């Protein structure tokens, strides 16, 4: 059927994550983990975690073969941003947005 | 008593955003640009009804003139042929009669040249 | 009768309320014309 | 208003070199938390009108009621007795003489019934009522008054 895994308040910017998520969307689940292990980006490990949890939820709660599971969807959504401040010069000060993201992945057999 | 403005501003602004859909970009999202473009739309529509009348008048004259030239006349010489032979039909009907029946428009052109 | 009351025809009028829109007639400047000593909150010169 | 809200009395910034709008206090109306431009003030609402118009309004209310029982006899205040008295004869205005303090008590608990006396006939009381139950004496006292 379909099995999802969501990771919430992952402390990475969401458009530093959609870079990687634009790769493994539509792919098989084997090459997906291959890519997510081989890539240089810092979003790969957390997305490795999430995609492996998606596959495990499939094979444990829904019992669909972990051989034909294709990543139907994968997307990041914004989250609660931590707003910080940085001392500029001459007494000024500039905001900083330590933003977060919610990483959802949905693997489905396609049947 | 106190009367805090609630769900009365929203209602009319929503009413104005529904009214502007199909617009490029923030014209259909934002209110202070959607209102301006809705006003411009109303003014343009007011103007364009009158100009619609004018446009079709031009087009009818153009096609009647294209028909009469295939019958060795003008628009002007023909339309004087009519109204001097005997008062007749208007331009829209006369054009689409020249379109549908090529066989009655020449009836009229002979009866018009008969007006000399 | 206390749920159908009718003041005598011609007695009451609703007050004039300026500075609310431009379709009433007294909205933008609110009946004061443009700039000047009398278009300022604080009245004009004293009477006389 | 501005004079009453706490704090203020300090121009926040300098008015000239900041780049922000020029402000005078943080307790001005356009801010939040300071200043109501107009509004409520503790003030009365009553007014008057001539004696003759007052009396004519009372006469007109009774006139539209016309458009009367014997004396009430209630030793003890017993609301069921009063409910029976109202059923044998529900916006009732039971008008009595000076005051019978066993008919007001017998009747103040019934919803829709209002009791009063000939010296205390309102116009809101009358026009709120669907019926008038005035005694033989109260009819004569009000014919004497008005």
């Amino acid at each position: 059927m379909e099995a999802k895994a969501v990771a919430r308040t992952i402390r990475i910017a969401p458009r530093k994550v959609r870079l990687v998520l634009d790769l493994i969307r539509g792919k098989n689940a084997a090459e997906a983990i291959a890519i997510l292990k081989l890539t240089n980006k810092a979003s790969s490990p957390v997305i490795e975690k999430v995609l492996m949890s998606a596959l495990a939820n499939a094979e444990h709660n829904y019992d669909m073969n972990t051989d034909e599971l294709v990543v139907k969807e994968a997307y990041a959504n914004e989250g609660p941003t931590l707003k910080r401040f940085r001392p500029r010069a001459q007494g000024r000060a500039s905001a900083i947005n330590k933003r977060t993201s919610h990483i959802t992945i949905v693997v489905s057999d396609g049947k | 008593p106190r009367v805090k403005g609630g769900t009365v501003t929203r209602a009319r602004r929503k009413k104005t955003i529904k009214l502007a859909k199909g617009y490029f970009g923030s014209k259909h999202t934002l209110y202070k640009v959607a209102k301006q473009q809705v006003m411009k739309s109303g003014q343009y529509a007011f103007r364009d009804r009158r100009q619609r009348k004018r446009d079709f008048r031009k087009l009818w004259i153009t096609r009647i003139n294209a028909a009469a030239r295939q019958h060795e006349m003008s628009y002007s010489r023909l339309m004087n042929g009519l109204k001097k032979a005997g008062i007749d039909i208007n331009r829209k009907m006369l054009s689409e009669i020249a379109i549908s029946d090529e066989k009655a428009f020449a009836q009229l052109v002979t009866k018009a040249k008969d007006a000399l | 009768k206390l749920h159908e009351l009718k003041p005598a025809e011609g007695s009451r009028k609703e007050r004039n309320r300026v500075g609310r829109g431009v379709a009433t007639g007294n909205g933008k400047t609110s009946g004061r014309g443009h700039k000047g000593q009398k278009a300022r909150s604080g009245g004009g010169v004293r009477p006389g | 208003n501005r004079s009453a809200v706490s704090g203020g009395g300090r121009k926040p910034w300098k008015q000239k070199g900041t780049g922000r709008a020029r402000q005078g206090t943080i307790r001005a109306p356009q801010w939040r938390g300071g200043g109501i431009v107009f509004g409520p003030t503790p003030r009365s609402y009553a007014y008057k009108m001539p004696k003759k118009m007052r009396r004519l309004a009372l006469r007109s209310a009774l006139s539209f009621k016309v458009q009367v029982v014997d004396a009430f006899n209630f030793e003890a205040p017993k609301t069921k007795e009063f409910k029976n008295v109202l059923s044998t004869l529900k916006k009732v205005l039971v008008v009595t003489e000076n005051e019978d303090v066993n008919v007001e008590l017998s009747a103040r608990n019934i919803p829709g019934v209002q009791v009063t006396t000939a010296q205390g006939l309102n116009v809101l009381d009358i026009t709120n009522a669907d019926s008038l139950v005035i005694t033989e004496a109260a009819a004569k006292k009000v014919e004497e008054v008005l």
């Binding site: - | 008062i87 549908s100 009836q107 | - | -």
Partner: protein, 100 residues
């Protein structure tokens, strides 16, 4: 076999079995109605036209009597605080042309 009927200050090229739309006529729903302002008749049949053909007429069944889509009439003068909104549902009557 068509014709040209003058109805409401406008000519209309009308054949049989056709549904037409005209400005408001006084008749009610589902009624006959004879057009006399016919200035030109005949297609493949004959080609006769006078100021008014005066021998031919048309007969139509009054199919319906209603009001068009509300067009809103908005317009404003910029920088001079003047604007004006109206509405308009132009009433029409639709007819079936029964015979010519």
């Amino acid at each position: 076999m068509f014709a040209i009927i003058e109805t409401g200050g406008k000519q209309i090229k009308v054949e049989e079995g056709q549904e037409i739309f005209v400005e408001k006529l006084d008749v009610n729903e589902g009624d006959t109605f004879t057009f006399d302002k016919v200035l030109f008749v005949g297609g493949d049949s004959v080609k006769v036209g006078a100021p008014t053909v005066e021998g031919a007429t048309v007969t139509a069944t009054v199919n319906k009597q209603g009001r068009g889509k509300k067009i809103t009439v908005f317009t404003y003068k910029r920088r001079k605080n003047s604007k004006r909104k109206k509405g308009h549902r132009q009433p029409y009557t639709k007819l079936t042309i029964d015979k010519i």
